[PDB]
Every structure is written in C-alpha cells, then in structure tokens.
Scaffold this active site. Sequence first.
Site: not given
Ligand SMILES: [Rh+3]
Length: 129
Positions: A35, A46, A48, A50, A52, A59
């Site tokens: 990660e 991300n 969309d 958002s 991380d 998220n």
């Molecule tokens: Rh995604």
Amino acid sequence: KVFGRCELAAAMKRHGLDNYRGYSLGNWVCAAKFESNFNTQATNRNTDGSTDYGILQINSRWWCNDGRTPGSRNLCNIPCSALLSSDITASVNCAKKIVSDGNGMNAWVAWRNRCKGTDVQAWIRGCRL
Ligand SMILES: [Rh+3]
Ligand SMILES: [Cl-]
Ligand SMILES: [Cl-]
Ligand SMILES: [Cl-]
Ligand SMILES: [Cl-]
Ligand code: NA
Ligand SMILES: [Rh+3]
Ligand SMILES: [Rh+3]
Ligand SMILES: [Rh+3]
C-alpha cells in the site's frame, strides 16, 4: 517516516494488530508494504476524487476527513492528515474499524491481490517480536 519491515511489525504488534480479527501480523505487514512501501506520508488520489492516506492507504471516501471528498464520511472521526504521522496510532485504530466492516482485509485491494493466500509469515521472518 519510512519504517523498516521489522520496526513496523513491532509497532503493529504493540498496537494490537497481531491476529486482530484473525489476521496474523504478516498480513498487516504485507498490506503496508504494497500500500505504502512502509511510508507513513504516502498519499494517492483515487479515480473518484477521494484520496488514500498513510501506511495502510485509508480512503477519505469513508474513513477520514480531508475537506475535499464530496459526499464522503469520516467514520474514524479524524482528519486524514492524522494518518500521515510518524506515530501509527491513528492508522492502526482506523484500520481496526475497517477490517471489522464485514469484508475483513479484502477492504485493501492490494492485500487481496498481493498478500491473500501467500506465505505472509515471510514478512515477519527474523523480527524480534
Ligand atoms: Rh478506486
Ligand atoms: Cl521489505
Ligand atoms: Cl504471519
Ligand atoms: Cl470532504
Ligand atoms: Cl475475515
Ligand atoms: Na471523508
Ligand atoms: Rh512507535
Ligand atoms: Rh504473532
Ligand atoms: Rh478538521
């Protein structure tokens, strides 16, 4: 902060992740490696909109507030910046809520694709635990 593998394993253990919800320590270390490469400051946007954050790439769409993820929640009741600290407390406590969600560690797509079913014990080999 960039942790060493055994350093992170130790910190994760101290914070109660070893076999939390049945996931042995090597699972958590393997997830962290893929990660964030053990970097607490890791961030990734991300598709969309958002983002991380941190060693376990938590998220903003559900778990933390970053003020820029429309319609999102903050279920760990923390600013997303708390997830970037050299102190992994916020990340671990939030991870515990995520993994308790119903889908276990499948919440971390890199865990499912890269760690699940593998010899995860290798990730804690040689650490003083
Ligand atoms: Rh995604
Ligand atoms: Cl490594
Ligand atoms: Cl393990
Ligand atoms: Cl927001
Ligand atoms: Cl499970
Ligand atoms: Na949010
Ligand atoms: Rh510590
Ligand atoms: Rh153990
Ligand atoms: Rh705030």
